[PDB]
Each structure stands twice: as structure tokens, then as C-alpha cells.
């Protein structure tokens, strides 16, 4: 129930970024959370993702779908910081020039729902 952010002081978060980004300059880091509303997806077991950096968000989603093990009728959309809807044929990379957090992280949120009320 706590968040990563919640789990891990700045302080650490900016190291894990600073070291991760040395050994490996071509892969993102990504944070990927279960939506608080959530009921219909999976957690995953893990948090903390190295994403290589030439990967489109629609790659990230079908691999995300298949750590999830997902029928292909199940929804599944990923919102940048929470709420943003990012073209799926966006690099990683630039998804990350844009929307990094001032930790180094890009966090991402999933759910099962595109739009809400």
C-alpha cells in the first residue's frame, strides 16, 4: 500500500538513478505501479524496470501484458505520471527527456480504464 516514492526517500531514488545511468546510459528507468482504483489487473511482483531506451510505449505495453499473462480482450493503458496518455509509437527515450521525475525515474501508473467519470 505504501508507494515506491513512499518506500524509498529521495535520497536513495536519486542514487539508484545516478548508478543505474552509468552502467547502463541506453536504458531507461521506469517505475510501473497497480492504479489505486485498480480491480481487474494483476500486480506485478516487480517495481522498478530497465527499459532499453530505443523501445516504443506500445512495445512496453505488450511486453507489460505478457509479464501480466493478459486474455487480449483485457484492458490495459499506461498513464505517464498517473494521467497521461502518451502516443504509443513514442521512444521511450523521449518519453523520458519529457516526463522524467526530479529523482531521475520516469514513473508510470497501469489500469483498466483509459477515462475516468
Known amino acids: 500500500e505504501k508507494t515506491f516514492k513512499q518506500r524509498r526517500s529521495f535520497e536513495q531514488r536519486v542514487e ?7 552502467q547502463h546510459p541506453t536504458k531507461i528507468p521506469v517505475i510501473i505501479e497497480r492504479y489505486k482504483g485498480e480491480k481487474q489487473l494483476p500486480v506485478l511482483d ?3 524496470f530497465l527499459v532499453p531506451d530505443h523501445v516504443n510505449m506500445s512495445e512496453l505495453i505488450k511486453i507489460i501484458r505478457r509479464r501480466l499473462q493478459l486474455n487480449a480482450n483485457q484492458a490495459f493503458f499506461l498513464l505517464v505520471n498517473g494521467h497521461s496518455m502518451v502516443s504509443v509509437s513514442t521512444p521511450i527515450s523521449e518519453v523520458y527527456e519529457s516526463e522524467r521525475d526530479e529523482d531521475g ?3 508510470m501508473v497501469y489500469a483498466s480504464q ?3 467519470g
Open 16 to 22: 539508484d538513478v545516478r548508478l543505474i545511468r552509468e
Open 46 to 48: 516487480k517495481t522498478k
Open 105 to 107: 525515474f520516469l514513473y
Open 114 to 116: 483509459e477515462t475516468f
